[PDB]
Amino acid sequence: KQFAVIGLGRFGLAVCKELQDSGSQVLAVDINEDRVKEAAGFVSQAIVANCTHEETVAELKLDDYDMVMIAIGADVNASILATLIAKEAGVKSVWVKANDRFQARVLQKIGADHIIMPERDMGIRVARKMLD
């Protein structure tokens, strides 16, 4: 029912649009104001915040949210650090998007429940669509 999406890039905004279509509350948060405005018309609540800030994550009660998606791609260090902060925040289910195999290794060990690699994961499915 209630979801949170951190990082509103091309991947993160795509999650927000589909989540709203199924009638679910989505908290879209992004450091960049422009990207938050784009998702403002597609989510229940759009907030400009830095999710690397520990106190900011405390205020945004992410432990209440059923699932939290971290969709930060360019800065590998932010996604790793935001994943950790969400874990101490009490988030039971943490989904993290990783662009590299080395990042996906770190995220697995630090405790991410689901690691998403869009290029590798889309590669497998597109092959399956080609086969059938």
Partner 1 sequence: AKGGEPRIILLSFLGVLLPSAVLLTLPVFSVSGLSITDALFTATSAISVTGLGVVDTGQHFTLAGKILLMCLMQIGGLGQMTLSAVLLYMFGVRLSLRQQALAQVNLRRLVKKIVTFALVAEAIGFVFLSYRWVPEMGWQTGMFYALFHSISAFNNAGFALFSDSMMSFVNDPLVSFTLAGLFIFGGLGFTVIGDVWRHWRKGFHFLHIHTKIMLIATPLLLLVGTVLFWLLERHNPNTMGSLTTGGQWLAAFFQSASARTAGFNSVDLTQFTQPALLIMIVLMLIGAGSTSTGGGIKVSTFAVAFMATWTFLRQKKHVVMFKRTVNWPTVTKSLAIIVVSGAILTTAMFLLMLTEKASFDKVMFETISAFATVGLTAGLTAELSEPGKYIMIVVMIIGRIGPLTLAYMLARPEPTLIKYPEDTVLTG
Ligand X SMILES: Nc1ncnc2c1ncn2[C@@H]1O[C@H](COP(=O)(O)OP(=O)(O)O)[C@@H](O)[C@H]1O
Per the annotation, binding residues are: 10, 30-32, 50-51, 72-74, 97-99, 119
User: Would you count residue 94 as binding ligand X (CB under 6 A)?
Assistant: no
Binding residues for ligand X restricted to 38-57, rule: CB under 6 A: 50-52
User: Would you count residue 27 as binding ligand X (CB under 6 A)?
Assistant: no
**What burial letters (b/e) apply to 31-49, b meaning 16+ CB within 10 Å?**
beeebbeebeebbeebbbe
User: Would you count residue 37 as binding partner 1 (CB under 8 A)?
Assistant: yes
Whose tokens are 């830095």? That residue is: 50
Numbered residues of the known binding site for ATP: 10, 30-32, 50-51, 72-74, 97-99, 119
* R_g of the chain computed on alpha carbons: 15
User: Would you count residue 40 as binding partner 1 (CB under 8 A)?
Assistant: yes
